[PDB]
Design a binder for this molecule. Structure first.
Ligand SMILES: *[C@@H]1O[C@H](CO)[C@@H](O)[C@H](O)[C@H]1NC(C)=O
Ligand SMILES: *[C@@H]1O[C@H](CO)[C@@H](O)[C@H](O)[C@H]1NC(C)=O
Lengths: 48, 48, 42
């Protein structure tokens, strides 16, 4: 089962919150039920 | 094929370093400890 | 040792005695929800 609900009054601040982060770049697609917490920069070129 | 319990445990992971995840299974004569953490290794892993 | 769908499974057996010629089975003993990427072991 998947449950979703609203938390506007619990996760909204006038100055803005930045505690919640997501990931945008990765080399390969993710296996089901897998967790990765790496921090290495995305190698788009040759020089590290 | 063993006598006197020389073989102790096992390590599983990707690169076996302080960077990414690692599983340790140790059997130090008292209980079967399974521990999955972010763990550091040396080049000569041994136990007394 | 097997690892599928984010689950780690361990079967084991012990017996008294090159490997001997005989037949025996193994019983399930560990299942864990580890869910990581495993490639090399020690
Ligand atoms: C050693 O054995 C004790 C027994 O209580 C256990 O608590 C501990 O985690 C074990 N340590 C290792 C490294 O296996
Ligand atoms: C697991 O790690 C290896 C090591 O580089 C990598 O090649 C592989 O793509 C990883 N698994 C997945 C599903 O990305």
């Amino acid at each position: 089962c998947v449950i979703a609900w609203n938390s506007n009054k619990l996760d909204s601040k006038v100055s803005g919150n930045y505690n919640y982060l997501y990931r945008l770049f990765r080399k390969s697609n993710l296996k089901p039920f897998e967790r990765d917490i790496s921090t290495e920069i995305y190698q788009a070129g040759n020089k590290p | 094929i063993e006598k006197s319990n020389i073989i102790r445990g096992w390590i599983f992971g990707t690169t076996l370093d302080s960077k990414t995840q690692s599983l340790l299974i140790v059997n130090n004569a008292t209980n079967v400890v399974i521990k999955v953490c972010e763990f550091q290794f040396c080049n000569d892993p041994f136990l007394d | 040792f097997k690892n599928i769908d984010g689950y780690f499974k361990i079967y084991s057996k012990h017996t008294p005695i090159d490997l001997p010629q005989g037949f025996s089975a193994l019983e399930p003993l560990v299942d864990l929800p580890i869910g990581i990427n495993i490639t090399r072991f020690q």
